[PDB]
Design an enzyme around this catalytic site. Structure first.
Site, PDB file in Angstrom:
ATOM      1  N   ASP A 194       0.809  -1.227   0.000  1.00  0.00           N
ATOM      2  CA  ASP A 194       0.000   0.000   0.000  1.00  0.00           C
ATOM      3  C   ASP A 194       0.836   1.268   0.000  1.00  0.00           C
ATOM      4  OD1 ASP A 194      -2.517   1.163  -0.336  1.00  0.00           O
ATOM      5  OD2 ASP A 194      -2.973   1.178   1.811  1.00  0.00           O
TER       6      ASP A 194
ATOM      7  N   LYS B 297       1.933   4.755  -0.947  1.00  0.00           N
ATOM      8  CA  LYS B 297       1.381   5.960  -1.554  1.00  0.00           C
ATOM      9  C   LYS B 297       1.738   7.100  -0.606  1.00  0.00           C
ATOM     10  CE  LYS B 297      -3.139   4.831   0.508  1.00  0.00           C
ATOM     11  NZ  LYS B 297      -4.563   4.584   0.155  1.00  0.00           N
TER      12      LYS B 297
ATOM     13  N   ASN C  17       0.385   7.390   2.951  1.00  0.00           N
ATOM     14  CA  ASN C  17       0.844   6.447   3.973  1.00  0.00           C
ATOM     15  C   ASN C  17       2.289   6.691   4.417  1.00  0.00           C
ATOM     16  OD1 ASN C  17      -1.605   5.148   4.239  1.00  0.00           O
ATOM     17  ND2 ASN C  17      -1.104   3.432   2.870  1.00  0.00           N
TER      18      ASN C  17
ATOM     19  N   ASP D  80       0.460   2.375   8.193  1.00  0.00           N
ATOM     20  CA  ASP D  80      -0.594   1.571   7.562  1.00  0.00           C
ATOM     21  C   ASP D  80      -0.101   0.228   7.022  1.00  0.00           C
ATOM     22  OD1 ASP D  80      -2.928   0.547   6.412  1.00  0.00           O
ATOM     23  OD2 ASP D  80      -3.617   2.510   5.696  1.00  0.00           O
TER      24      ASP D  80
ATOM     25  N   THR E 288      -4.122   0.638  -3.750  1.00  0.00           N
ATOM     26  CA  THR E 288      -4.817   1.852  -4.181  1.00  0.00           C
ATOM     27  C   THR E 288      -4.716   1.863  -5.697  1.00  0.00           C
ATOM     28  OG1 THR E 288      -4.162   2.995  -2.147  1.00  0.00           O
ATOM     29  CG2 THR E 288      -4.892   4.382  -3.960  1.00  0.00           C
TER      30      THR E 288
END
EC number: 2.7.11.11
Lengths: 339, 20
Positions: A155, A157, A160, A173, A190
């Site tokens: 994840d 991005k 985060n 996260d 995402t």
């Protein structure tokens, strides 16, 4: 550096001990005063809290047990806690406490007041290449560390990535993080950051993290992601085509690195070849990067968030507040026994 | 420009994670 190799082997031993015998129940809810919501999700939220006995501030992630079960996110949530309590690295947010009560699961993380890279990136517009490279190097080392423990992150991005008081990255996260040897299949992440193999349902491995790094570097340096559209499906179409256009201001070295990370062909993607992470570390774009100095946090950060006290929340957006309910009846006890 | 197109798009705010 035989150093890295022996650092990693010792790191794996510490990780494996905690992985095999996880800590549980290390605080309780009434030891924390809740101050402000820092972020929300479909089955929980994160609140700034103050620990009464120390006075320290933490970010407390609160998950509704019934909702986690209803949405079939039990394994993902158990993955998150088990992995977080076992890892340790300069660029990972630390889990300080965890516990559960009748209604909720709680993970109490260190508080990083500088806010998400996301906010700073949208505000500034884009980062200069040395600025983006500084953050990218931290992610490279962190993925080297995670992948060595057979962990996939899934994840990456800007939302985060938190910026600390020294201007360094803290990854948060771990909701989709998983310990896996071999292939996995869960469609998660995402949309803008999904590798082609996730979208195409073929099974995938840790090379998806390296693809995501390509997207992150592009987005930091450009100010917008390499593949965007108003609907996820249109984004997926672009991703699997793999056609990428670069801004006029991208250096030749940056374009070449990105062609190698945003390689649709798994088997040709940097990070996933014979030399593994060294193909990235040795790339021309990183020629000025002192990898040891980065790990040791001895490199001067290009940007330090303005700070006005521990507990300041100005670098975070406002969210609507709501009660923390704890039922008089225990919910989903068996599902979360190991938490 | 690509940037103007991004900024006029529906996905400039914080992006939700998905599972599916």
């Amino acid at each position: 550096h035989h150093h890295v190799k022996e650092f990693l082997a010792k790191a794996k031993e510490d990780f494996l001990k905690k992985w095999e015998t996880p800590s549980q129940n290390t605080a309780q809810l009434d030891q924390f005063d809740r101050i402000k919501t820092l972020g929300t999700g479909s089955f929980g939220r994160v609140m700034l809290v103050k620990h009464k006995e120390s006075g320290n501030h933490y970010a407390m992630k609160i998950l509704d047990k019934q909702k986690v079960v209803k949405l079939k996110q039990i394994e993902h949530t158990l993955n998150e806690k088990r992995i977080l309590q076992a890892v340790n690295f300069p660029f990972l947010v630390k889990l300080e406490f965890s516990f559960k009560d009748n209604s909720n699961l709680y993970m109490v993380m260190e508080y990083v007041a500088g806010g998400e890279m996301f906010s700073h990136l949208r505000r500034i517009g884009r980062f200069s290449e040395p600025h983006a490279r500084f953050y990218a190097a931290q992610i490279v080392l962190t993925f080297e560390y995670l992948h060595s423990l057979d962990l996939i992150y899934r994840d990456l991005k800007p939302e985060n990535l938190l910026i600390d008081q020294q201007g360094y990255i803290q990854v948060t996260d771990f909701g989709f993080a998983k310990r896996v040897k071999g292939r996995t299949w869960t469609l998660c992440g995402t949309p803008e950051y999904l590798a082609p193999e996730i979208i195409l349902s073929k099974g995938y491995n840790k090379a998806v993290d390296w693809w995501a790094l390509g997207v992150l570097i592009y987005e930091m340096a450009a100010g917008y992601p390499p593949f965007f559209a108003d609907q996820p499906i249109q984004i997926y179409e672009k991703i699997v085509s793999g056609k990428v256009r670069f801004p006029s201001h991208f250096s030749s070295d940056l374009k070449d690195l990105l062609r190698n990370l945003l390689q649709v062909d798994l088997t040709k993607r940097f990070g996933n070849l014979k030399n593994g992470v060294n193909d990235i570390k040795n790339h021309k774009w990183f020629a000025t990067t002192d990898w040891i100095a980065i790990y040791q946090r001895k490199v001067e950060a290009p940007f330090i968030p303005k700070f006005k006290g521990p507990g300041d929340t100005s670098n975070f957006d406002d969210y609507e507040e709501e009660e923390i309910r704890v039922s008089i009846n225990e919910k989903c006890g068996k599902e979360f026994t190991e938490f | 420009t690509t940037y103007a197109d991004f900024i006029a798009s529906g996905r400039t705010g914080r992006r939700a994670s998905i599972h599916d």
